[PDB]
Structure 1
Amino acid sequence: RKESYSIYVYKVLKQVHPDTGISSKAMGIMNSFVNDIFERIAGEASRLAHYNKRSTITSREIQTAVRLLLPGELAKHAVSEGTKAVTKYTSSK
């Protein structure tokens, strides 16, 4: 078992492009890229936690990191989506 997100890519793409197919090599490249950005996020948030002389990671800090790595309009909408999802999790069942 060596994990992939291909299936979830498929699902969200169906959520936006229900009618589009995707070649396998393209899906694998997408998976490699998303893993890269993911580990970027991870390492950066770790740096952050260290940099406040703390030990624990919280959504606020993933937020910090993504704000750091993302430009402008994309940054704004990303922060918005993250906060909205955090709420729809917490202030919910």
Structure 2
Amino acid sequence: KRSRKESYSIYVYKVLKQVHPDTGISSKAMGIMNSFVNDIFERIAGEASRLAHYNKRSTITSREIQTAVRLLLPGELAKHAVSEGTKAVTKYTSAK
């Protein structure tokens, strides 16, 4: 009956196994991938949070995220993150 500390480690595995199905990952290295996601979570949730505050909006939409992601991410990483982002919202709304 211990606290119950969540993480992202099961999703990192899931994606590790998609991209390098034969490869694995040490505790320390997952620990890093965990920090990484929370870090770029907070970074985006913030810039979005601002964008909204700055334009007197109460709702963080996908539009805010896309701006956050343009702002926070470099040239080529940005173009793709937007795309997989765009792609995922589009796939979700059609799906159901």
Q: TM-score range by the shorter chain?
A: over 0.9
Match of 1:43, SS state, is: helix
What displacement does 1:34 show?
1.3
Which deviations, in whole Å up to 9, do the C-alpha atoms of 1:18-68 show, x marking residues without a partner?
000111111011101211111111111101110111110110110100110
Distance 2:54 2:32 in 1: 33
TM-score for the superposition, normalised by structure 1: 0.95
User: Which deviates more from structure 2 when the two are superposed, residues 29-38 or residues 8-17?
Assistant: 29-38
Task: Give the distance between the partners of 2:24 and 2:95, measured in 1 at CA.
Answer: 35
- Kept in 1, the 8 Å contact 2:16–2:24? The answer is no
Gaps of 5+ in 2: none
CA RMSD of aligned residues (A): 0.8
Q: Distance in 2 between matches of 1:36 and 1:79?
A: 18
Cα separation, 1, equivalents of 2:90 and 2:52? 22
1:78, distance to aligned residue in structure 2 (A): 1.0
**Shift >2 Å, 4+ stretches:** none
